[PDB]
Enzyme design. Structure first.
Site, short mmCIF file in Angstrom:
data_model
loop_
_atom_site.label_atom_id
_atom_site.label_comp_id
_atom_site.label_asym_id
_atom_site.label_seq_id
_atom_site.Cartn_x
_atom_site.Cartn_y
_atom_site.Cartn_z
N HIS A 636 0.82 -1.20 0.00
CA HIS A 636 0.00 0.00 0.00
C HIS A 636 0.86 1.26 0.00
O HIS A 636 0.47 2.28 -0.58
CB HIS A 636 -0.92 -0.03 1.22
CG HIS A 636 -1.83 1.15 1.34
ND1 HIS A 636 -2.98 1.27 0.58
CD2 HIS A 636 -1.78 2.24 2.13
CE1 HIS A 636 -3.59 2.40 0.90
NE2 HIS A 636 -2.88 3.01 1.83
N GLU A 637 2.02 1.20 0.65
CA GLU A 637 2.87 2.39 0.64
C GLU A 637 3.81 2.41 -0.56
O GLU A 637 4.20 3.48 -1.05
CB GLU A 637 3.65 2.49 1.94
CG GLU A 637 4.02 3.91 2.23
CD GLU A 637 2.78 4.72 2.51
OE1 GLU A 637 1.81 4.18 3.09
OE2 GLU A 637 2.73 5.90 2.11
N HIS A 640 2.20 4.48 -3.20
CA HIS A 640 2.50 5.91 -3.18
C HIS A 640 3.92 6.19 -3.68
O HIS A 640 4.17 7.24 -4.30
CB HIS A 640 2.32 6.48 -1.77
CG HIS A 640 0.90 6.46 -1.29
ND1 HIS A 640 -0.04 7.38 -1.71
CD2 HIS A 640 0.27 5.66 -0.40
CE1 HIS A 640 -1.19 7.13 -1.11
NE2 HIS A 640 -1.03 6.10 -0.30
N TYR A 678 -11.78 2.45 1.70
CA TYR A 678 -10.66 3.25 2.19
C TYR A 678 -10.17 4.22 1.13
O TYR A 678 -9.83 5.37 1.44
CB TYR A 678 -9.52 2.34 2.63
CG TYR A 678 -8.38 3.08 3.30
CD1 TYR A 678 -8.48 3.48 4.63
CD2 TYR A 678 -7.22 3.38 2.61
CE1 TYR A 678 -7.44 4.15 5.25
CE2 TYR A 678 -6.18 4.06 3.22
CZ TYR A 678 -6.29 4.44 4.54
OH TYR A 678 -5.26 5.12 5.16
N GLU A 685 -5.51 7.63 -2.43
CA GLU A 685 -5.80 6.44 -1.65
C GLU A 685 -6.44 5.36 -2.52
O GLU A 685 -6.19 4.17 -2.31
CB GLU A 685 -6.71 6.80 -0.47
CG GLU A 685 -6.17 7.91 0.42
CD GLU A 685 -4.86 7.57 1.12
OE1 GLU A 685 -4.64 6.39 1.45
OE2 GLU A 685 -4.06 8.50 1.34
ZN LIG Z 1 -8.36 5.61 3.01
#
Ligand SMILES: [Zn+2]
Ligand SMILES: [Ca+2]
Ligand SMILES: [Ca+2]
Ligand SMILES: [Ca+2]
Ligand SMILES: [Ca+2]
Lengths: 723, 523, 523
Positions: A636-637, A640, A678, A685
């Protein structure tokens, strides 16, 4: 070399005697040479549960304390499983509430292995049936030993330590089988104790069944003293004599107290709650009008208690520029807690993540507490000290905090999650203040972890009147054993630890950091001196955060092809990148406040990408609102991170991200409404959520992104074409 | 540490309480006896003495016997620490050839056997007396002198090999007329004599007395009276001493087994003969086998420290008795088929032990009879009759008739039938006669020495020949109604000379009727 | 820190104050004497000397004797510290032939170990004189020279074995005429001669002087005067010396017993013979059995440190006397039936020890008589007479009649009865006469050399044979009124030659009747 008259001297040393003491003195000294080999601890426990050691002569059924035995109990099977009769045998042990040890005395205990072996078997049967059955032992540890014995390749342990009934049992050993057949487990433990004590058969028990040897060796080294002290815990007068000695020793430091010291101790007990009129009168301006009209139950940055406190503050009288006032007023209503500050900082009390004079008041009060905690523990009124603590699991991890206890019955421990817990829980670092107990008190409903701290000769502490003690800051603890106990039909966790200085634990963490850096430069093809992985770890669940980094990075490695990994990690090495796997709070590792503009704009969540210094954080205990484990947090990171590196491959003098371009905002309004909740907050996101779910462990979660957002699938697979 | 009085490698409490050697993952491990495992594997519970480096006083230690670090030729029942290992050599003579000292010569094939009368060993040669007067064939006067020549083989029946040395054998005629002394040439032959083997072994040539090669050895000669007595008795007698030479021992640094010159058999045999209990047994194939089991001598403090040896356990460890379903027996042959002969002193001791236990049947109390050292027990077979040297020379008529029940291929050429290998030994010949319906009986080999009509065939049975002394012709059956009796004689009934009246005929020879069939298709 | 002067391995206070050797849980265990424990088990109270490595000065130490760490051939009554262990070897001659350098004489000789009124072991060979003149029968003139040839067996009676070396025996005729010198063949035989055994043993061939296979043995020859003296005396004498080879020792490292080349029997016999008291005895089987018991010598300060030895305890430890109910006896035979013979010095010493104690009868004071070194005591059976050699050669008439008195058969053909194996050693034969009532006696075999009618029987009960020398025909009396008298002749009355008058009659034979019946139905 030995000549022959030297052999005459050796054989006369074995043969010739000078003094003969009659019969009965040698009869008496043979029995004490028999009982000299046993540890003194089980003799003292057999003394404490009300037992009598009767060394007799002649028949053993003719003694008074064995008179009322029936005809049926005089048929005894010895250590080898063969028949005997009590007027033929020589040692019997009486069962019940008043146990009695009867030993026929003779001169055959000095050289023989058989008779001494049967005596230590009866002593072991006493230990398995009487002493340990008052604290509900043997239990799951010994069941793991038993299942290791009967699932071996070789069948000699089953012949040596089991009866015929334990052989033909087709499945493995469950705790039901320890409930309704506890006497068989007692026989097996007795037989293992018998073969371990008698020093001729020790190598035999090592050779035929090594796991029983390891269990009994570690038992007779540590667990027998621990079990004696826990048996004295069940009694009240031992508790209050320990209370008496600790109160008399710590009397003068409580005599050298002032009023300010007692006020600091009581403010260290409880948080100083904020009052509401001091909050409302603090604003008095337009700020009151911004507090007065506000969506309470809409913004996702404050917790349940905090939105309820703001609902309490509306009756004391929006994702736009009003919620910055919410970010600023989050820290304004938090209680003056020294434990929360020490727990969140991890040793850096100069971290500027809160207010100014509140930081100074924190630092001065912590220096006052540490200066008052100067008394050492080293004394002569006592031997080893066993101090306790009940603690919540959620203070260590929120990943295992929900699925530790089974859902059918809440007084069990789920064994798969327990083995996940047991796997890498090797040590502990106590930065905050362990408010420990002198004796045992029962736990709260959320606290199943039952610590037991063994101290150091250099332990510094201070005393409280209500039945507690406090430890100082930055204490190292090395975990000895983690086992499931049972107490009042509620299954628990017992954890021991041993006090070490901090330099050994930080030396271990430095060694592990250098090893993981060498391995992940070797797996990525990078410069020799690069620091790409670092650990700022100071809390109790340190060892598993050190060990779990390997699984996290291997799962990130297996879920993505190697080329994107190599390219984006090369970009991060150029941009001074790290992968901070820490268990302290996110605004306090000093990769994040060295680039932010405001104190209240700080972030605390699962993973975080610092855009200027190109760093990836992670949090140890906390669990995400969306995620299922930490590996999807790392993917998830890395989403980014891929966003930033794609933002650099459009123009090397322009915007930082590829999602801030208006060529993805249309796809975000088209296919940004078919996935999980989310990512729906804004576009980045959703970007990270798509990049998380496209590389799942099972392929069906990868196929959900195939079925719901196909053009976003084609666009993301075009964003990998930047190489 | 752990006390070790004798320095043999095994501690004391293991040696008094039972120890055994177990192997787990290919490593030798010496363990206390734990009976709930070690009966399932089939290991053996050994016991020995805490204060002797060898329990049965033989040159191999306790540890080197229980672990297999021993000379490889030692018999497997001498691996136990309680059974002594020592060689027993007698001499096996195969044939003799008599000649006149210058045809006139004689060539006969002899059958020798080992004897035991009522420590030294010997053997008794029985020269075959059948056909093929000795003075008539040789042509001897009163002024003659005879030359004797034979072929011998050394045979070992003990439990230990003999390296490079052979004993010195005397040859005795009658009672104490020494004809010759046999020695081993060159004194060191580089040979080996394993237990239950020969020298030179059965696929080489036998040792010849005064062979065709050498000449300088002593010619064996007789006068006239010695030849008279040898024609009378048909029986020589060998006597063998006990010089057996050095011993093969073990080395721990390289595993080699070598003949150590600093260790001799002739100084360790008179310890085995003083601290053991000797049991002789002939249930194998009616040859005497001698063993020695270590036992407790009560009046000697280093001899009461041996383990206690019941007679059951002695038979089990010595001869391979086992009890499948309670009855102790030897390959089916139960021990009620076996006698017990004692000498005087141990008969006194056994009778006192039986009077103590208030029992009278020795075959039921064998697990309670204790053995002491310096005994002598002889366990023979009940079926047969034995002579002055404990050799089977007779039987009862029931088993001799039941040996000839199973018929194979009967004709008038002879009889081919299945006969047992134990009952061939006692039988010396057969007599064959023709009986009419009217009551006349005509023996067809009317001499004392035309009885060798049976002959073994290499498949494992014997074929009686009728042609053999009827001028190589088949049996003349004129009228097949009347019958032919062909039946046997035992060695205790056999005549080995012409009579004092000179009677050569078959009259006076005792006989067992084994066979009478009709003559037609049944026979 | 433990006092030990003699380096034997036992401390001093144990040796002066009493000690015993017990075996407990199969382990040897030496300990002080404590009476209320050790009297019940039947253990033996040992005492010894603190300043001698061996109390009786034989090459076995005190520790090695009491604990069993010894060569196992040493006799059981030499395991006590006070009894000396050393070999005693004499030569046993079986049979002789005299040949002329058939016409050769062959007799069977019966030799015995003698002790006349310490060095060397002499034995006296008695040649049989019965029916097979010697000068006629060999055909010898005056200028002849005879040749002697016989068979011997070395026999040990001591308490310690001999390894590999046999002694050197002289053969003496008459008083001091040496005939020859018997030496050991081949200088090493590699044998063992245990206590109480024969070399060669009883089931082999004896050692022949001037053997058949040997030729380099010197002929043992005589002249005419020696031949007449040998015929007129019927006696030889064998004087054996004391070269006994080396000693077997015990190796404490691995339980091995081997012949030690640096220790010798020839350097420890003249200390045993100088510090110990000798007690010679013949109650068991009427042979002279020599033992030596350690005793004090008062004028030597390392000899007064031996234990105090009475005569009761000397008999108990050497010969196995016991007192079951206060009467000291030898397997039922009581010691009031034995006489005591002394030589002169110990006779004077015993008379002084009796005049000290105000006692007159020796048989009631035996636990008060103290022995000293160099005594010599001879204990003989009362019932018999003895000659100069102390061989049993006679008895009184009463014990012969009362021993023959239980008669089984008495007729005109012989006489069978049960006879004891002590009385069968003093009788040389039997003759039967018929005495008339007017006084006429009728001896039926009236010669000195037809006495050997008695024969040992497989029943053990001898049959007096009336047939053999009456022209193989029994006795017919004409009137049963006058009596039949049969009488044994005892060895001191037996004549071995004709007189100077050439008489061969029965007069001169002093009679001892075993038969007194009137001839008729009574016998
Ligand atoms: Zn979120
Ligand atoms: Ca041993
Ligand atoms: Ca041993
Ligand atoms: Ca001493
Ligand atoms: Ca001494």
């Amino acid at each position: 070399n030995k000549t022959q008259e030297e052999h005459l001297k050796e054989i006369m040393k074995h043969i010739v005697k000078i003094e003969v003491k009659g019969e009965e003195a040698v009869k008496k000294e043979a029995a004490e040479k028999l009982l000299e080999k046993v540890p003194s601890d089980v003799l003292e426990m057999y003394k404490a549960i009300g037992g009598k050691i009767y060394i007799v002569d002649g028949d053993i059924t003719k003694h008074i304390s064995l008179e009322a035995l029936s005809e049926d109990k005089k048929k005894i099977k010895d250590i080898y499983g063969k028949d005997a009769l009590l007027h033929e045998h020589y040692v019997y042990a009486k069962e019940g509430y008043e146990p009695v040890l009867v030993i026929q005395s003779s001169e055959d205990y000095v050289e023989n292995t058989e008779k001494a072996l049967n005596v230590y078997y009866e002593i072991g049967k006493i230990l398995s049936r009487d002493i340990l059955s008052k604290i509900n032992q043997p239990y799951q540890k010994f069941l793991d030993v038993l299942n290791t014995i009967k699932n071996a390749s070789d069948s000699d342990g089953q012949d040596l330590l089991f009866t015929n009934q334990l052989k033909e049992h087709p499945t493995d050993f469950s705790v039901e089988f320890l409930e309704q057949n506890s006497n068989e487990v007692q026989e097996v433990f007795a037989k293992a104790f018998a073969y371990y004590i008698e020093p001729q058969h020790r190598d035999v028990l090592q050779l035929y069944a090594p796991e029983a040897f390891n269990y009994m060796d570690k038992f007779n080294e540590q667990e027998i003293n621990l079990s004696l002290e826990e048996l004295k815990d069940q009694r009240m007068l031992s508790r209050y004599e320990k209370w008496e000695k600790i109160k008399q020793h710590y009397q003068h430091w409580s005599d050298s107290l002032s009023e300010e010291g007692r006020g600091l101790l009581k403010k260290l007990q409880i948080p100083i709650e904020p009052k509401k009129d001091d909050i409302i009168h603090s604003l008095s301006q337009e700020e009151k009008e911004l507090l007065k009209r506000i969506q309470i139950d809409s913004s996702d940055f404050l917790s349940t208690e905090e939105k309820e406190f703001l609902k309490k503050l509306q009756i004391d009288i929006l994702s736009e520029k009003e919620k910055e006032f919410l970010k600023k007023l989050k820290l304004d209503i938090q209680p003056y807690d020294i434990n929360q500050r020490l727990q969140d900082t991890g040793g850096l009390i100069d971290s500027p993540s809160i207010n100014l004079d509140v930081r100074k008041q924190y630092k001065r009060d912590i220096q006052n507490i540490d200066a008052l905690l100067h008394q050492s523990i080293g004394s002569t009124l006592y031997n080893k000290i066993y101090l306790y603590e009940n603690m919540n699991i959620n203070n260590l991890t929120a990943t295992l905090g929900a699925d530790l206890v089974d859902s059918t019955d809440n007084t069990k421990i789920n064994r798969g999650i327990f083995n996940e817990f047991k796997k890498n829980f090797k040590y502990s670092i106590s930065s905050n203040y362990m408010i420990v107990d002198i004796n045992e008190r029962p736990a709260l409903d959320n606290e199943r972890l039952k610590w037991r701290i063994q101290l150091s000769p250099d332990t510094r502490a201070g005393y409280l009147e209500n039945g507690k003690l406090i430890l100082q800051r930055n204490i190292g603890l090395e975990i000895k054993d983690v086992q499931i106990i049972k107490q009042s039909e509620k299954e628990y966790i017992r954890i021991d630890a041993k006090v070490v200085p901090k330099s050994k634990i930080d030396t271990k963490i430095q060694e592990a950091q250098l090893n993981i850096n060498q391995e992940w430069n070797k797996a990525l093809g990078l410069p020799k001196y690069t620091k790409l992985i670092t650990f700022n770890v100071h809390n109790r669940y340190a060892s598993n955060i050190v060990e779990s980094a390997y699984l996290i990075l291997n799962e990130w490695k297996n879920n993505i092809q190697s080329d994107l990994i190599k390219k984006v990690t090369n970009y991060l090495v150029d941009g001074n990148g790290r992968f901070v796997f820490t268990d302290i709070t996110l605004p306090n590792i000093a990769e994040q406040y060295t680039h932010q503009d405001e104190i209240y704009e700080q972030v605390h969540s699962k993973g975080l990408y610092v855009p200027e210094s190109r760093s990836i954080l992670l949090h140890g205990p906390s669990k995400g609102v969306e995620l299922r484990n930490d590996s999807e947090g790392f993917i998830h990171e890395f989403g980014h991170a891929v966003d930033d590196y794609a933002g650099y491959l459009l123009d090397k003098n322009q915007s930082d991200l590829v999602t801030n371009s208006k060529k993805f905002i249309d796809i975000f309004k088209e296919e940004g409404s078919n996935l999980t909740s989310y990512g729906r907050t804004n576009e980045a996101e959703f970007f990270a959520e798509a990049f998380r779910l496209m590389h799942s462990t099972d392929h069906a979660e990868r196929l959900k992104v195939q079925k719901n957002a196909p053009k976003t699938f084609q666009f993301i697979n075009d964003q990998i074409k930047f190489i | 540490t752990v006390p070790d009085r004798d320095n043999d490698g095994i501690p004391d409490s293991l040696e008094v309480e039972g120890y055994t050697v177990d192997v787990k993952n290919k490593r030798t491990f010496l363990s206390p006896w734990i009976s709930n495992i070690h009966e399932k594997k089939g290991l053996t519970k050994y016991k020995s003495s805490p204060e002797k480096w060898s329990t049965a006083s033989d040159p191999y230690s306790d540890f080197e016997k229980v672990t297999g670090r021993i000379d490889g030729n030692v018999s497997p029942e001498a691996n136990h620490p309680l059974v002594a290992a020592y060689p027993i050599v007698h001499v096996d003579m195969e044939n003799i050839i008599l000649s006149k000292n210058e045809t006139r010569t004689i060539s006969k094939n002899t059958s020798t056997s080992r004897t035991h009368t009522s420590n030294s060993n010997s053997s008794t040669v029985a020269i075959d007396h059948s056909l093929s007067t000795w003075a008539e064939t040789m042509g001897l006067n009163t002024a003659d002198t005879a030359r004797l020549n034979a072929n011998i083989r050394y045979v070992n029946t003990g439990t230990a090999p003999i390296y490079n040395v052979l004993p010195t054998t005397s040859l005795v005629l009658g009672k104490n007329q020494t004809l010759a002394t046999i020695k081993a040439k060159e004194n060191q032959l580089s040979q080996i004599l394993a237990p239950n083997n020969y020298y030179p072994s059965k696929n080489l040539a036998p040792i010849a007395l005064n062979a065709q090669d050498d000449f300088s050895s002593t010619p064996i000669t007789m006068n006239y009276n010695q030849f008279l007595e040898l024609e009378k008795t048909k029986q020589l007698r060998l006597d063998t001493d006990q010089v057996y030479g050095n011993i093969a021992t073990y080395n721990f640094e390289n595993g080699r087994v070598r003949v150590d010159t600093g260790s001799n058999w002739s100084e360790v045999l008179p310890q085995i003969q003083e601290t053991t209990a000797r049991i002789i047994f002939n249930g194998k194939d009616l040859n005497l086998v001698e063993r020695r089991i270590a036992a407790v001598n009560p009046s000697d403090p280093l001899e009461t420290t041996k383990p206690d040896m019941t007679l059951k356990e002695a038979l089990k460890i010595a001869f391979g008795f086992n009890e499948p379903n309670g009855n102790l027996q030897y390959q089916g042959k139960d021990i009620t088929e076996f006698d017990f002969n004692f000498d005087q002193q141990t008969s006194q001791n056994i009778k006192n032990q039986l009077a103590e236990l208030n029992a009278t049947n020795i075959y039921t109390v064998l697990d309670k009879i204790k053995l002491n050292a310096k005994m002598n027990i002889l366990i023979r077979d009940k079926r047969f009759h034995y002579d002055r040297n404990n050799i089977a020379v007779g039987a009862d008529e029931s088993v001799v008739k039941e040996a000839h029940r199973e018929v194979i291929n009967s004709s008038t050429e002879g009889l081919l039938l299945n006969i047992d290998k134990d009952i061939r030994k006692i039988l010396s010949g057969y007599i064959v006669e023709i009986e009419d319906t009217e009551g006349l009986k005509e023996v067809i080999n009317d001499r004392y020495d035309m009885l060798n009509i049976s002959s073994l065939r290499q498949d494992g049975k014997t074929f009686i020949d009728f042609k053999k002394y009827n001028d190589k012709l088949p049996l003349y059956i004129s009228n097949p109604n009347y019958k032919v009796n062909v039946y046997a004689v035992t060695k205790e009934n056999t005549i080995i000379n012409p009579s004092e009246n000179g009677d050569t005929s078959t009259n006076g020879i005792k006989k067992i009727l084994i066979f009478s069939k009709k003559g037609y298709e049944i026979g």
